[PDB]
Nucleic acid binder design. Structure first.
Lengths: 551, 151, 107, 89, 49
DNA sequence: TTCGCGAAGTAACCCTTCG
DNA sequence: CGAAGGGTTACTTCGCGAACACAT
């Protein structure tokens, strides 16, 4: 009866609790009743979609999915059967609905990415371009430029099109990444067995060595095609500069900004790892290799459904193989990018102050060890999780929580007698903060016993970690807190809707000029005070949720 | 039996002397408390040679007047050395125990003066200790009250 | 149609529906020396066409459910070759009843 | 109730950066409830986007706009101030 | 009519009966109610039991 | 202190392929 | 061609019932 404490949905869903909510936040219930519905039973066609959502007929489940089609929120599979018609079988897109939660910080630090050249017009112009880019799903150049009505401002916008395309933020959206990747491999695998049905004495070696490896070398090339494929740009008599093709669509490319956010996380780590002067040159030597060869974040495009027999060693070996020599520019040299004019005492900057990052990998982790620039981003991710995960559990459960959670990582299957010799707890503070932590994971105990029904207590329950559970569980808990914060925002905007329809329609400049009587005007600065705090918590919570889903 | 008879009245106090001495071995004393001249690119690509403990630090702590008879730091030379491992000391090869992490988080905050200076640059980073004084008042529906739910 | 001579192996029928319009059979020379149709306990079975299948669904107002079902790997169904959804008409003969009929859907 | 703690929340919209991201979230949420932004829903929907739905409704994707859907509701400011017919709203 | 020669007892009755409370009165009244709520059975009541 | 079949649980052994 | 993995059939253990209703 005390329904304030959000007990109404404690066993609801962690995955439905965010996606349907983010769809409801921009359109409403008739669009949230399909992405929230296609996440609850899998893939589904249009004919078997109508009779379960309890709504209108095919004239409405088709219209609201077009609004999800031109927003890139679903995935379709155009395939036919052996005796049936051509079906649809729609999916749901994870990153295509992360874009709705993610767009504001996308544009707001693409501003800081594009801060380099000048000051005033570039910020406003990028905040006009990319804000309209992400609010649509796919737009062209000639359709945008039909509402400018200028001659030099249009020239500046046409320059900034290719200035954003050269960074790696605008690529041609093709069907080959608008298709589900779990079945795009199988389409490149069933015609490949159809390619060689040769009557010849070949064993099961054909199904592991020929078809698999040739599909690898025909798939890794074809996923890298949307990186740079729309490059001719040699239209001379129109403009005297590189002009983007008008009849060519553009999307956000979704992946370089992932890389920029994770590089920002690496710099935020390096501000605490090394000193104040080493992290600056580490930033200026790290924030230039994100635009050439993108494979840094991703759990790999092919590893989702074939890592079942033995291939994980091959995935790690191929990752560390193509992980080097592809960004292989000048590893430690000079560049005309930025030198941060400061003491960054050293009043001389060539080949003597730019060698301080050579002493940044031999200490505690930045991990560019072997020769010159080799392996900079492979052996951080199993510890970049473990560095941020300890700083959350220690800041929440207390300073003695990281003292117990890190000891068991050193020696798994640890007893309480030998953890007393390793820790310093008095008599019972070993087990008190253990029982305060056992309701959370990374405590997970294993039992020994060889008895009948626990007769003489057998000296049981020595503690392990099982660190692959607790990272996923922390990700679930953070994602639930994310979506619960957004539902606090939704209940706030749902509570007082009778004073919102007038406060934004005709009340712009005269809001302080006595248009509302002084009895409820403080509610207008109350519905804007802690609704600002919701988005501030969202901003400072994206910087902690997106570290537990690395490769 | 060198640790079972000391429960617990000066083990947490004994941490401070050895941590301050390793911080003195790895950093300057007075130049750590402030940011004026941050230790010269720290120690000019610092000090491959300088280790922490070999055969002298045990007798140094023994003769440091810790209000005890000079008996039984016998096996606390390495057990207390590995016992301080969480965010404080360094392991990499042998006796390379370094301090650098928490000398900014709690040294310049607890034993320091307060100022509302140029602190409008900390952007969503790893700040455990900071931002005390939970609510004033009543915890308006989006504060720290909800973490107990498992999910 | 394949006719075994002895005990089968588990790896023979591992891909039987692998051909999309066709299949293979599975027999045994031991239990095929006499056919079950001429036996006195089995009445006359005959398969109906697709046009005659929708006639009893109009006469009894039924559908592709709620019928007395017969299964695959049944000796009558393996003798006759009932694939799926094929109505077989049984012309069974009780003693004091006459020459009445019954219909069975194959599943 | 039950009092756990979160490290991050308090004393953090006083700076301009988190306020900038928050006000831009407000602006994105305010604009996103308008559908197509006065130039759209016409170009790229036939171009390999759900052929079974871009073929059955070739003139019927123009249902969402801000040129006519925000146009029809703005004609009624003048038909009511001069003429009155008794019809339910 | 089901397809196989089956029995009348507590495993021979569960071949056709989607009715749960009919099965939860014949034998094993405990196990038939715990299994029906696990599998989310609809149980449109039409039988005379 | 008792017969009835149906669930898991565990072992002997034969087919199939690898280098 | 010898050895390793996947999978069919065969030996052994538990539990659920044992009819209706009256007076104790």
């Amino acid at each position: 009866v005390m329904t304030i404490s959000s007990l109404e949905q404690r066993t609801l869903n962690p995955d439905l609790f965010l996606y349907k909510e983010l769809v409801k936040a921009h359109l409403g219930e008739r669009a949230a009743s399909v992405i929230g519905m296609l996440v609850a039973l899998g893939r589904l066609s249009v004919r078997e979609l109508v009779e379960k959502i309890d709504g209108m007929d095919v004239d409405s489940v088709k219209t609201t999915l077009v609004s999800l089609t031109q927003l890139r929120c679903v995935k379709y599979l155009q395939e036919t059967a052996i005796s049936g018609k051509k079906t649809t079988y729609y999916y749901y897109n994870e990153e295509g609905i992360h874009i709705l939660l993610y767009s504001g910080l996308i544009i707001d630090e693409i501003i800081t990415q594009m801060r380099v050249n000048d000051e005033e017009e570039h910020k406003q112009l990028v905040a006009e371009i990319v804000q309209n880019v992400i609010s649509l799903g796919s737009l062209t150049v000639e359709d945008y430029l039909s509402s400018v009505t200028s001659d030099s401002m249009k020239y500046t916008i046409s320059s900034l099109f290719v200035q954003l395309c050269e960074m790696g933020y605008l690529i041609q959206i093709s069907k080959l990444h608008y298709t589900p990747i779990e079945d795009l491999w199988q389409f490149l695998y069933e015609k490949h067995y159809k390619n060689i049905p040769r009557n010849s004495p070949l064993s099961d070696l054909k199904k592991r060595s020929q078809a698999k490896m040739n599909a690898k070398t025909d798939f890794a090339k074809i996923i890298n095609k949307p990186n740079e494929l729309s490059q001719i740009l040699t239209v001379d008599p129109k403009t005297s500069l590189r002009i983007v093709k008008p009849t060519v669509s553009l999307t956000i490319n979704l992946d370089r900004f992932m890389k920029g956010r994770r590089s920002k996380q690496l710099i935020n780590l390096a501000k605490t790892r090394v000193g104040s002067v080493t992290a600056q040159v580490y930033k200026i030597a790290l924030r230039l290799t994100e635009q050439k060869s993108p494979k840094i974040r991703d759990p790999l495009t092919q590893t989702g459904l074939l890592q079942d027999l033995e291939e994980a060693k091959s995935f790690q070996d191929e990752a560390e193989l193509v992980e080097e020599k592809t960004p292989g520019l000048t590893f430690n040299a000079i560049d005309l990018a930025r030198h941060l004019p400061a003491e960054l005492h050293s009043a001389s900057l060539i080949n003597s102050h730019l060698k301080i990052l050579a002493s940044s990998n031999f200490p505690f982790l930045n991990e560019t060890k072997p020769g010159v620039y080799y392996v900079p981003y492979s052996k951080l991710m199993p510890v970049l999780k473990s560095s941020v995960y300890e700083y959350v559990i220690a800041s929440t459960l207390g300073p003695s929580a990281m003292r117990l959670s890190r000891c068991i990582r050193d020696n798994k299957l640890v007893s309480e007698k030998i953890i007393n010799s390793t820790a310093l707890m008095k008599e019972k503070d070993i087990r008190s903060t253990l029982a305060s932590l056992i309701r959370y994971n990374s405590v997970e105990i294993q039992e020994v016993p060889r008895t009948a029904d626990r007769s003489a207590s057998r000296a049981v329950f020595l503690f392990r970690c099982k660190e692959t559970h607790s990272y996923n569980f922390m990700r679930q808990n953070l994602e639930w807190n994310m979506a619960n914060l957004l539902f606090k925002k939704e209940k706030l905007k749902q509570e007082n809707s009778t004073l919102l329809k007038k406060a934004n329609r005709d009340d712009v400049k005269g809001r302080e000029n006595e248009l509302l009587l002084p009895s409820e005007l403080n509610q207008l600065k109350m519905v804007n005070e802690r609704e600002l705090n919701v988005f501030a918590r969202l901003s400072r919570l994206l910087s902690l949720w997106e570290v537990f889903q690395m490769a | 039996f060198t640790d079972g008879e000391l429960d617990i009245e000066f083990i947490n106090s004994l941490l401070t002397i050895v941590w301050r001495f390793i911080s003195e071995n790895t950093f300057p004393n007075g130049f750590k408390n402030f940011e004026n001249g941050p230790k010269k690119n720290v120690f000019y690509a610092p000090n491959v040679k300088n280790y922490s403990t070999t055969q002298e630090i045990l007798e140094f702590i023994t003769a440091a007047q810790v209000a005890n008879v000079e008996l039984t730091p016998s096996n606390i030379r390495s057990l207390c050395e590995v016992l301080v491992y969480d965010d404080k000391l360094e392991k990499v090869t042998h006796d390379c125990y370094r301090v650098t992490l928490e000398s900014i988080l709690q040294m310049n905050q607890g034993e320091g003066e307060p100022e509302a200076g140029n602190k409008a640059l900390e952007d969503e980073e790893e700040f455990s200790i900071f931002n005390y004084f939970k609510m004033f008042p009543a915890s308006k529906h989006d504060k720290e009250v909800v973490y107990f739910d498992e999910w | 149609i394949f006719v075994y001579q002895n005990n089968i192996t588990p790896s023979a029928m591992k891909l039987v529906p692998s051909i999309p319009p066709a299949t293979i059979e599975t027999f045994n020379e031991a239990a095929l020396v006499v056919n079950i149709t001429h036996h006195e306990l089995v009445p006359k079975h005959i398969r109906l066409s697709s046009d005659e299948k929708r006639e009893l669904l109009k006469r009894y107002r039924l559908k592709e459910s709620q019928l007395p079902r017969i299964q695959r790997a049944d000796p009558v169904a393996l003798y006759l070759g009932l694939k799926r959804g094929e109505v077989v008409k049984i012309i069974r003969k009780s003693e004091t009843s006459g020459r009445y009929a019954s219909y069975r859907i194959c599943m | 109730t039950e009092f756990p703690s979160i490290p991050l929340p308090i004393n953090g919209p006083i700076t301009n950066k988190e306020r900038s991201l928050a006000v831009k979230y407000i602006n994105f949420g305010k604009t996103v409830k308008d559908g197509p932004f006065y130039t759209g829903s016409m170009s790229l929907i036939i171009d390999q986007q759900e052929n079974s739905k871009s073929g059955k409704r070739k003139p019927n994707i123009i249902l969402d706009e801000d040129d006519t859907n925000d146009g029809i509701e703005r004609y009624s400011d003048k038909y009511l101030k001069k003429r009155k017919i008794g019809i339910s709203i | 009519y089901k397809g196989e020669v089956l029995g009348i007892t507590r495993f021979g009755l569960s071949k056709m009966r989607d009715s749960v409370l009919q099965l939860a009165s014949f034998e094993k009244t405990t196990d038939h109610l715990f299994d029906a709520a696990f599998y989310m059975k609809k149980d449109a009541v039409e039988g005379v039991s």
